[PDB]
Amino acid sequence: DIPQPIRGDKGATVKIPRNIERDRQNPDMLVPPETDHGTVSNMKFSFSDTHNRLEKGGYAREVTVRELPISENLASVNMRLKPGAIRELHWHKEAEWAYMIYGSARVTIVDEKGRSFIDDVGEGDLWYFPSGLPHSIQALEEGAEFLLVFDDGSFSNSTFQLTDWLAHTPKEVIAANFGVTKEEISNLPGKEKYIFENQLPGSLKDDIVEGPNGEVPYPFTYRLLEQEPIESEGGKVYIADSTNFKVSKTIASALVTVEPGAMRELHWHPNTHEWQYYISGKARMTVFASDGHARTFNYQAGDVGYVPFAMGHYVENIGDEPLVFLEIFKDDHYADVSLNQWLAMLPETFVQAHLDLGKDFTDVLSKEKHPVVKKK
Amino acid sequence: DIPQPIRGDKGATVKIPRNIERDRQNPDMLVPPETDHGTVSNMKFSFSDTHNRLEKGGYAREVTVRELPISENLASVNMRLKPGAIRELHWHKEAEWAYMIYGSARVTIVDEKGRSFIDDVGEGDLWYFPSGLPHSIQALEEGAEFLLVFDDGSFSNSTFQLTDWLAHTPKEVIAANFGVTKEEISNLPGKEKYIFENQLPGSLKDDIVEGPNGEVPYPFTYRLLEQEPIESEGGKVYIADSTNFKVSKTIASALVTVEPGAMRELHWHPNTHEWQYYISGKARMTVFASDGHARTFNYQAGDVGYVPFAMGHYVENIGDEPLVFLEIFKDDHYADVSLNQWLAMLPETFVQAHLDLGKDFTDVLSKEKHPVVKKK
Amino acid sequence: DIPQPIRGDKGATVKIPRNIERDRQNPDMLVPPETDHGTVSNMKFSFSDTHNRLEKGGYAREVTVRELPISENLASVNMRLKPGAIRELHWHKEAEWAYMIYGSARVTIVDEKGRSFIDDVGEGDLWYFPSGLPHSIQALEEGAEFLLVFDDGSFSNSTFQLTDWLAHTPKEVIAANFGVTKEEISNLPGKEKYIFENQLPGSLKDDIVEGPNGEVPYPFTYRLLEQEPIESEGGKVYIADSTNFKVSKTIASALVTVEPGAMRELHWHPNTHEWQYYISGKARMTVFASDGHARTFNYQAGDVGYVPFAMGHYVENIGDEPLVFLEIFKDDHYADVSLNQWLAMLPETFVQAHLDLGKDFTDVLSKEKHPVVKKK
Amino acid sequence: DIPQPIRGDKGATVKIPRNIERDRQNPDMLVPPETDHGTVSNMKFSFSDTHNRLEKGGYAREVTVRELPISENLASVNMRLKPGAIRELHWHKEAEWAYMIYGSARVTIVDEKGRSFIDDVGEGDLWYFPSGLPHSIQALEEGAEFLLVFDDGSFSNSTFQLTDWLAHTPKEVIAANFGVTKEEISNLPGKEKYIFENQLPGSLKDDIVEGPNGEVPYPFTYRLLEQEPIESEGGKVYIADSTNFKVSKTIASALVTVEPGAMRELHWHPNTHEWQYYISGKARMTVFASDGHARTFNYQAGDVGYVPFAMGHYVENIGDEPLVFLEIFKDDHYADVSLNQWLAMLPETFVQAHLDLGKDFTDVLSKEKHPVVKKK
Amino acid sequence: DIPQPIRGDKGATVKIPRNIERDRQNPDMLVPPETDHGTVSNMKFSFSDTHNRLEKGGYAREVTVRELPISENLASVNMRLKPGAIRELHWHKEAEWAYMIYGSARVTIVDEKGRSFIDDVGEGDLWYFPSGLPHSIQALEEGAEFLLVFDDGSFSNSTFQLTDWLAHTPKEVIAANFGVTKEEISNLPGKEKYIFENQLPGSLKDDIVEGPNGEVPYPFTYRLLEQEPIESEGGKVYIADSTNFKVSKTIASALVTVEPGAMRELHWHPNTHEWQYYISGKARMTVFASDGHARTFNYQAGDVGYVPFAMGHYVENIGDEPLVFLEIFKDDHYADVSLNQWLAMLPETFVQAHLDLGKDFTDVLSKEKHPVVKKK
Ligand SMILES: O=C([O-])C(=O)[O-]
Ligand SMILES: O=C([O-])C(=O)[O-]
Ligand SMILES: O=C([O-])C(=O)[O-]
Ligand SMILES: O=C([O-])C(=O)[O-]
Ligand SMILES: O=C([O-])C(=O)[O-]
Ligand SMILES: [Co+2]
Ligand SMILES: [Co+2]
Ligand SMILES: [Co+2]
Ligand SMILES: [Co+2]
Ligand SMILES: [Co+2]
Ligand code: NA
Ligand code: NA
Ligand code: NA
Ligand code: NA
Ligand code: NA
């Protein structure tokens, strides 16, 4: 019913007004593992705790370094479009990564050689837009809801939109630029649109714009869920980085599915920081920060998590439904070190010497890697 | 039942897994006022979203700049003690301010001239401990739960405790220091205690330690709720700063009570930033950040809020119970500018010229200040 | 006619397209003193080199740290109002200092106790508005042009205006705040005004708003040119700081007049940095930056200058008209050390030992201070 | 005659002493486009506003981050040499890029394998010296004036010269280093030379030093104006980056010629910041900074301009002579996105939906890129 | 003989070439107390490890933040003058504090009102020169060696000297400034002197310069060793801060003498950081840094030590001669909390509860403060 912060003979009942409903969401924080210790930065924020920007055509909300200070290199947007609705043609400094959670959308991109790419993106699909290349998103008939990642954390939306530019350009100059009159463009919008209602497009193949510069070298979309996952006992892992999704130079990703009674094994990342989005399910994760520092967090749908470079962690399902979350990295490749596989590949007695345990332990070690394992 | 982010013809239903329960807590964020605009830093964090440290004798949890990056100058602890239980003798770099929310406690402090102050602190009472002066807290028979503020935001607990010092001092040196043998102190704790169980003390007057250095010049405790408040229509405001609570040089405070259907009026602070703790009730606040920037937040019990220097704001009760919250300032005095009183003290026609309104508006302006006002 | 960068046998003629007209403005930079040496930061910027913001009622342009990086603590605005025209009621984080160069204006200010101050300010008059206290400016019949200083350099205008606040506040809340209906304020401006046209006010004494809180302790205006200046041979110096202009806690100022063939003597400032505005005339100044570093600059009307803390400098008139400029300091008092008076107050032979000169030099030293001296 | 800051019913005449001559240089700043909005950092500085360092043999002046704070990654020197005159053998941390505007010069460079490169550089030619590789410049018979760029903005000249090193090395050590006596080097300069007069060299082929290490892999000079430019209607663009000028790893450049009545089209850069030098002509440029922020600047000969990463801009000729300026980038390649070509490669109706315009607009869009366009 | 890093069953002999002589100087670092733990910044640097600047007349060497990064607010110079020798008239941004260790010197200072102070300073005497006020030092017949402290740590000597200024000022300007000819000052030094040989002065009373501005309000010299010290069992403490040495606003100091077999008691400072100079003797000090962090250092003559704000420490004599060292604070007052006196002024049983000890311990506690205690 009413949880209290009490572990054996430690803790006490809360005696002041309180937020019982969040307490129920964070059992491993109201009552942390004995093994937790030391000061650790917050690694947890909820999109439901952010200002939702509402437009005609949908909404957008963001978690940034101003919300989650630990994540300096990475920021995120939860964006929703209604059918036909357009996220306005635009560009950023930051590169853009996306996972399509609900629905479908058509995207356009034009690169620096004037070659265009137009494609339809479904559930489980990704796009990656390189830094500074202009693009757009239009929801199809189901509408669309997707998660966006940008490789800077100071990122507010702070974005360049097509009509915001022209609205703050002398009409004199725009005319000269295109070779028309001032009057011929009297009706340019006096203000940005950002997201706006529009009619559903037609077939993709009818929208494909052909040009003298040719096809682009590598596609900007990736069908993640149509690749053969790494399947282990308690779940699936789908990886997309610059090695298979070529243009994704600055973002490496993994979609992790964890069945009930399963966990993303103890591991860490040797290349860089890990940014997390929880799509569905409930989880806990303890972050090992070295020098006997450790802090445990709770996550569920709509939460952003974080694991600083090289810190040891696990991700454990603690509910009845499957756990589905994204592992995101600002890097050109995915990499992890498995605790199991590490010790498996060392001399038996050496490990035994370290852990004060016998052969009955080293016998269970596996030399294959199993990202997601299941209980007994 | 199920809230959606929809305002008239803007927004759309959520189509991905989500945190309905937080959504219900943040109505003015899932559906913000039309008048909200622009990128504004998060001004909202919940203690229920922090790691609770559990000890024999109670708990402590903290909101810091690592949780709420905007608050660089101020940090807070929610501390709970069981009866008899001692928060260990210690000292910090930071000055310490407190509000006793539940129960009662006995405190000790000794200053830099070797004068001691020992006092009992009840519900509604404050203490202020200057930077670097050593102190302690012991809960009496009801136990104790209080809110602590420290005038640095980078503050982890990162504190100097008496037994942690001696445990990391050569026994050789401790002995020489006091003029005893190594054996006479063989039983010094090999580890810090921090919070620990203990027997209830006796009467205060039996604990008063007398010394050759004399009484301290100004008390370190303040009975806030025994002062005559500023009473206006919709509520009460109790102010304590360096002008009435003399030793409170670096912390100015206000306890604000707002009845249902009432609000803390539109105002701002000309001296410095405002840090907020919500003791009970539910609230919304819009922060006006200049240059047409504004963001609205929701608050309830256990939440920390923030208002950057000089930004315009109001605090409105949006539930059935009274709204009770603290306004905290890193400064030697409390100061606000009331929107009402400002315009009241200007020429009638001048204000009219500004607002495009008539005498039917200027007639309502009041030259007295009413921090908390009530509706119609 | 055509200046070249040539000093004796150093330099050469310019051989690329060039800006002859600026070259003519900076003779001591195109051809620096032999004695100049080393890398020194730019200490010179012109308001004519800034974006002029044009409104109905006037203009405003600013020199900030984004223009002049050396000046981190101080920024400036050149503001112009037409007759009747209002700079909109507003407030800043930064304190505000002003010199009325042309015309006259009426100002209002209300402090944190709800006491109002309304006064008329003429040519040669100052105002100082403490941090966060709300104010306004309205030009009288001649109109008005004045120089503003704010004690932060990162200061863009980034200011809080009255109608910008209300436009980004829920109408629901504004109504409750004042106790009127939504309809009663349907006509509130949907946008800031900033500067706007208005009818000339009436007599000052008819505008004086009386209140229950009383008169303010110290006036916010100062008649600088009606004080007896420090008169020396080549000019006049008028000083206003916290010692005579009481409320001017964070800004110390001097208006310096230098006749032709005269100079502001060799001196430095022991308290803090010096910020300069050149009102009229032409000047040169060499900044001595220690360790044999020295750079000379040219200044004329509309230029901002700067002298980092304690650096040695002189200000010399190099044209036919009087030189009039402001010395501004972020401090509660004015202070200078005169090179002459320094050496005058030391033993004769001691100075002689230092400078390798005789009694024919020490005999000219004066023990009185003469800020501004004249040639032979 | 006398310009005023007046646009229709906005602005007013200047009423204080002022710099009419600079006002005449900045028409689009004294009177900005209506479409300008918001606070934008200064993007404009003039070499004529810098201290000219005069030596026997020529001069050097620099624009740095201390002059133009926005340009943190890039700094520049305007250097002039007389005939025969030597810029002393030296090296920097920063890489060095150059454009030869007037005259000609002979350069030497020796790399880290002891291979030397000696070459003659004429008008329109470039050199690039990698970081830390030692080099020199000697003007031939016409003398020489060139623009230097270094890929750090904090760059003062702060350079290592050959004789400054030896002058601050123990003579004992120098002797041991070369295997001579102290007396054999008694005449080493006791001070740096930097720039000094010297006799004209002979034929290049007579100076070519041959060594056991061999020819260098890629030349350090590039004949820019002997390459076939991108020719469009209103001008020419010559590009040199790491793809054609191999060693130019950290500097990408474009020489842009704009005829009268022409403009460098609306575009932006997706890779990095743009640094500008105006060689001849007069120009205006509006910088689109996103979020409805835009500021217009004026440029002419001797001015440095700047465009932060990805910001939208155009460069328009506003005088009777051709406009010639350099686009400089700290990157290994040149890249731009053309506004025209972007929209050209999108579906017709999609663009129409965005801009609120018809087919009479989309019909003018071109799929080829025309950097420089001409009016009607 | 040969020390090894071995404590009981921990450590091992050194097996690589090593610095046995420093090892002998740092016994408590080669073999630290068991109680040491954790990463702590270096708190120790030796003047013998710095570049000695040699001039005609003496030397100067400095320890700065570039040597000892922990000390950001404070820097020091060891300065030596020969008889008659002059440290050149000069001024700094930083305030200047001094202790005269050997010999004697005459100082001059002139303040901002043109009042001069000239005085003779002996062994055990201090001077304090406020920020930016010009001064000089001349050694008398024994010569002089003194320790200087400046309240900034980034302080190189980076100082303004009188002849460096005039050497980098146009002769034209100097002449106009004083009203003489260029020829009358043809012999001004073309270079700074800094320290230079000179004849011994005469009697002080013959050097006293009288002026129209009057005597200075408070002297700039303090006879420290002629005040009655705090005398305790193992030593003496002489304190000088703004309360007794009035002008010493930004520097608080203590000269501490510790007899053999004695120690500066366990204590900390509640106001600010402690900077240390060891004049004579040998010492060890353990710094308690909180969170179980502690590091022990060794000090002897010529060493600079440091104790960050509020950190617990003791200073123990570990040799045969008395220990003499300075405690320096950037603050307007001296303050310490004694561990003994703290616990002495608390209830007996309360302390007992904390330390797990009995009355046989609390009985030894003293309510008087004894900075320096002696062993048994
Ligand atoms: O989709 C985007 O690029 C955005 O929201 O800024
Ligand atoms: O109470 C305190 O001082 C703490 O928690 O650090
Ligand atoms: O006058 C002012 O305060 C301004 O321009 O921001
Ligand atoms: O040419 C250069 O390298 C310079 O001026 O430092
Ligand atoms: O004595 C001084 O002031 C110095 O050494 O800079
Ligand atoms: Co991971
Ligand atoms: Co407030
Ligand atoms: Co000055
Ligand atoms: Co460009
Ligand atoms: Co101490
Ligand atoms: Na550990
Ligand atoms: Na606005
Ligand atoms: Na020098
Ligand atoms: Na906008
Ligand atoms: Na510990």
For residue D42, give the CATH number of its domain.
2.60.120.10
Cα dihedral C326, C330, C332, C333 sign: negative
Write out the residues surrounding ion ligand 11, Cβ under 5 A: A 292
DSSP state of C52: P
DSSP D52: P
Task: State the Cα–Cα distance between residues C167 and C174, nearest whole angstrom.
Answer: 10
> Do E43 and E57 have their domain in common?
no
Tell me: do B172 and B267 sit in the same domain.
no
- Tell me, yes or no, whether D117 and D202 share the same domain: yes
Burial B229-241 (b: 16+ CB within 10 A, else e): bbebebbbbbbbb
Task: Indicate whether B332 and B275 sit together in one domain.
Answer: yes
Check if A86 has its Cβ closer than 6 Å to any atom of ligand 1: no
Residue pair A145/A102 in contact by the 8 Å Cβ criterion: yes
Asked whether the beta carbons of C123 and B347 are under 8 A apart, the reply is no
CA distance A276 to A289: 17
Q: How far apart are CA E175 and CA E265, in angstroms?
A: 61
| D371 touches D233 (CB < 8 A) | no
Does the CB atom of residue D195 touch ligand 4 within 6 A? no
CA D45 to chain centre: 13
Query: CA-to-CA distance for D299 and D277, rounded, in angstroms?
Result: 9
Taking the C-alpha atoms of residue E153 and residue E65, their distance in angstroms, rounded to an integer, is 5
Task: Please enumerate in sequence order all residues whose Cβ is within 8 A of that of B211, keeping only pairs 6 or more positions apart, or say none.
Answer: B114, B115, B116, E344, E345, E367
Domain span at residue E262 reads: 1-50+224-376
Whether residues D33 and D55 share a domain: the answer is no
3-state secondary structure A42-60: CCEEEHHHCCCEEECCEEE
- Of D350, D139, E72, D18, the residue nearest C101 (C-alpha): D18
SS3 content of chain B, % helix, strand, coil (to 5): 15, 40, 45
Number of H helices, E strands in chain B: 7, 26
Torsion over CA of B346, B351, B352 and B354, rounded to 10 degrees? 160
CA distance D94 to D62: 15
Q: Round to whole Å and give the CA distance between D292 and A314.
A: 45
Radius of gyration of chain B, Cα coordinates, nearest whole angstrom: 24
Tell me the longest C-alpha to C-alpha distance in chain C: 86
Q: Return the bridge partners of A119, or none.
A: A107
Residue in chain E closest to C286 (alpha carbons) equals E169
Residue that the structure tokens 């972020």 belong to: C330
- Whether residue D67 has its Cβ less than 6 Å from ligand 4: no
Provide the residue type at D135 as one letter: H
SS (H, E, C) chain E: CCCCCEECCEECCCCCCCCHHHHHHCHHHHCCCCCCECCCCCCEEEHHHCCCEEECCEEEEEECCCCCCCCCCCEEEEEEECCCCEEEEEECCCCEEEEEEEEEEEEEEECCCCCEEEEEECCCEEEEECCCCCEEEEEEEEEEEEEEEECCCCCCCCCEEHHHHHHCCCHHHHHHHHCCCCHHHCCCCCCCCCEECCCCCCCHHHCCCCCCCCCCCCCCEEEHHHCCCEEECCEEEEEECCCCCCCCCCCEEEEEEECCCEEEEEEECCCCCEEEEEEECEEEEEEECCCCCEEEEEEECCEEEEECCCCEEEEEECCCCCEEEEEEECCCCCCCEEHHHHHHCCCHHHHHHHHCCCHHHHCCCCCCCCCEEECC
Compute the nearest-CA separation of B312 from chain E (Å). Answer: 35
Domain boundary (D199, D223, D247) is at: D223
Is B67 annotated to bind a ligand? Reply is no
D67 and D176 co-located in one domain? yes
Q: What angle do CA B355, B357, B362 make, to 5 degrees?
A: 95
Q: Are E265 and E364 in contact (CB under 8 A)?
A: no
By DSSP bridging, strand B44-46 and strand E96-110 are unpaired
The answer to whether E119 touches E209, Cβ cutoff 8 Å, is no
The one-letter amino acid code at A368 reads E
A171/A228 same-domain check: no
Which two three-digit tokens encode residue E75?
Answer: 């820097």
CB A261 within 8 A of CB A374: yes
Candidates A261, A247, A265; CA nearest to A315 is A265
E238 and E344 housed in the same domain: yes
Give the Å distances, CA to CA, from C243 to C132, C217, C335.
Answer: 22, 15, 12
Minimum-distance ligand to the CA of D306? 9
Phi, psi at C350, each rounded to 5°: -60, -50
Give, for ligand 4, the residue of D63, D159, D220 to mutate: max count of ligand atoms closer than 8 Å to Cβ: D159
Annotated active-site residue B327? The verdict is yes
The answer to whether the CB of D362 falls within 8 A of the CB of D352 is: yes
Q: Return the ∠ at Cα D235 (arms to D232 and D238), rounded to 5°.
A: 90
What tokens appear for E257 in the block?
């003498």
Q: Return d(Cα D243, Cα D251) in angstroms, integer.
A: 11
Distance of CA A46 to the CA centre of its chain: 13
Structure tokens of B200? 């209830």
Q: How far is the CA of D165 from the centre of ligand 3 (A)?
A: 53
Question: Which residues are CB-contacts of B337 (< 8 A; sequence separation ≥ 6)?
Answer: B267, B268, B269, B270, C91, C110, C112, C132, C133, C134
CA atoms of C273 and C310, how far apart (whole Å): 7
- Tell me D171's DSSP state: H
Q: Please tell me the total count of domains within chain D.
A: 2
Residues B271 and B331 in one domain: yes
Instruction: Name the 3-class secondary structure at B118.
Output: strand
Q: How many residues does chain C have?
A: 376
Query: Whose structure tokens read 């009255």?
Result: C162
Classify residue A52 as left (phi > 0), alpha (psi -120 to 50) or beta: beta
Exposure string (b/e) for A168-196, b if CB count within 10 Å is 16 or more?
bbbbebbbbbbebeeebbeebbeebbbbb
> Does residue D203 share a domain with residue D292?
no
Task: Write down which chains contact chain C via at least 3 CB pairs under 8 A.
Answer: B, D, E
Chains D and E touching, counted as 3 or more CB pairs less than 8 Å apart? no
Cβ-defined contact of B179 to E376 (cutoff 8 Å): yes
Q: Rounded to whole angstroms, how far apart are CA atoms E176 and E178?
A: 6
Q: Which of D215, D241, D237 is nearest to D225 (CA)?
A: D237
Distance CA E71, CA E166 (A): 34
Tokens 């609570």 correspond to: B245
The rounded distance, in Å, linking the Cα atoms of C72 and D356 is 45
Residue type, D189: P
DSSP C194: S
Instruction: State how beta strands E262-268 and C10-11 pair.
Output: unpaired
CA distance A116 to A109: 6
Residue with token string 């020969």? E82
- The span from the CA of E189 to the CA of E198, in Å, is 16
3-state secondary structure of B178: helix
- Picking from A24, A247, A221, A46, the residue whose alpha carbon sits closest to that of residue A130 is A247
Do A and D share at least 3 CB pairs under 8 Å?
A: yes
* Secondary structure letter of residue C354 according to DSSP: H
The DSSP secondary structure of C199-251, one letter per residue, reads -----GGGT----TT---SS-SEEEGGGS--EEETTEEEEEESTTTSTT-TT-
Same domain, A55 and A162: yes
Three-class SS state of D210? coil
Handedness of CA E20, E21, E25, E26 (dihedral sign): negative
Give residue E331's identity as a one-letter amino acid code.
Answer: D
Q: What residues does E62 pair with on adjacent strands?
A: E77
What resolution, expressed in A, was reported for this entry? 2.6
Distances (CA, A) of A143 to C226, D178, E347: 73, 78, 71
CA distances E188 to C265, C358, D292, E166, E167, Å, are 19, 11, 59, 8, 7
Task: Say how far apart CA C198 and CA D115 lie, in whole Å.
Answer: 76
Q: Is the distance from CB of B350 to CB of B241 less than 8 angstroms?
A: no
Last residue of a domain, one of D223, D255, D277: D223
User: How far is the C-alpha of B58 from the C-alpha of B70, rounded, in Å?
Assistant: 29
Q: Rounded to the nearest whole angstrom, what is the distance from the C-alpha of residue E269 to the centroid of ligand 10?
A: 6
E185/C361 CB distance under 8 A: yes
The dihedral formed by the CA atoms of E222, E224, E230 and E236, expressed in degrees to the nearest 10: 160
Give the position of tokens 């256990």: B302
Contact residues for D212 (Cβ-Cβ < 8 A; gap 6+)? none
Instruction: Note whether E252 and E333 are within 8 A (CB).
Output: yes
Determine how β-strand C230-232 pairs with β-strand C235-240: antiparallel
Label each residue of chain A as H, E or C: CCCCCEECCEECCCCCCCCHHHHHHCHHHHCCCCCCECCCCCCEEEHHHCCCEEECCEEEEEECCCCCCCCCCCEEEEEEECCCCEEEEEECCCCEEEEEEEEEEEEEEECCCCCEEEEEECCCEEEEECCCCCEEEEEEEEEEEEEEEECCCCCCCCCEEHHHHHHCCCHHHHHHHHCCCCHHHCCCCCCCCCEECCCCCCCHHHCCCCCCCCCCCCCCEEEHHHCCCEEECCEEEEEECCCCCCCCCCCEEEEEEECCCEEEEEEECCCCCEEEEEEECEEEEEEECCCCCEEEEEEECCEEEEECCCCEEEEEECCCCCEEEEEEECCCCCCCEEHHHHHHCCCHHHHHHHHCCCHHHHCCCCCCCCCEEECC
User: Residues near D43 by Cβ (< 8 Å), separated by ≥ 6?
Assistant: D70, D285, D287, D295, D297, D305, D306, D307
Output the CA torsion sign for E167, E172, E173, E178. positive
8 Å CB contact of C29 and D42: no
**Which of A108, A160, A211 faces D290 most closely, judged by CB atoms?**
A160
User: Which residue type sits at C127?
Assistant: W
Distances (CA, A) of E112 to C271, C347, D242, E97: 10, 18, 59, 19
Q: What is the distance between the alpha carbons of residues A304 and A307, in angstroms, rounded to a whole number?
A: 11
Task: Show the tokens assigned to A13.
Answer: 């009942």
* Rounded-to-integer distance, Cα C33 and Cα C12, Å: 16
Experimental method reported for this structure: X-ray
Domain shared by A229 and A84, yes or no:
no
User: CA-CA distance, E23 to A315, in Å (whole number)?
Assistant: 49
DSSP structural state of residue C45: E
**A214 Rama class: left (phi>0) / alpha (psi -120 to 50) / beta:** left
Q: Determine whether the annotation assigns residue D168 to a binding site.
A: no
Phi, psi of C17 (to 5 degrees): -55, 145
Nearest to B360 by CA among C184, C174, C211: C184
Nearest residue to A287 via CA among A31, A26, A36, A22: A36
Q: Is D313 annotated as a binding residue?
A: yes
Query: Please, are residues E142 and E83 in contact by the beta-carbon 8 Å criterion?
Result: yes
Tell me the C-alpha distance between C343 and C369, whole Å.
11
Torsion of CA A175, A179, A182, A185, to 10 degrees: -80
CB atoms within 10 A of CB B97: 26
Any idea which residue has 């405001």 for tokens?
B237
Residue having the nearest C-alpha atom to atom 6 of ligand 3: C157
Annotate E220-239 with b (16+ C-beta within 10 A) or e (fewer): bbbebeeeebbebebbbbbb
Hey, are the CB atoms on A279 and B17 less than 8 Å from each other? yes
Distance separating alpha carbons of residues C376 and B177, to the nearest angstrom: 74
Q: Tell me which H or E stretch contains D106.
A: strand D96-110
Residues A41 and E11: their CA atoms lie apart, in Å, by: 35
The answer to whether C296 and C332 have CB atoms below 8 angstroms apart is: no
**One-letter amino acid of E76:** S
Domain stop point among D205, D223, D241: D223
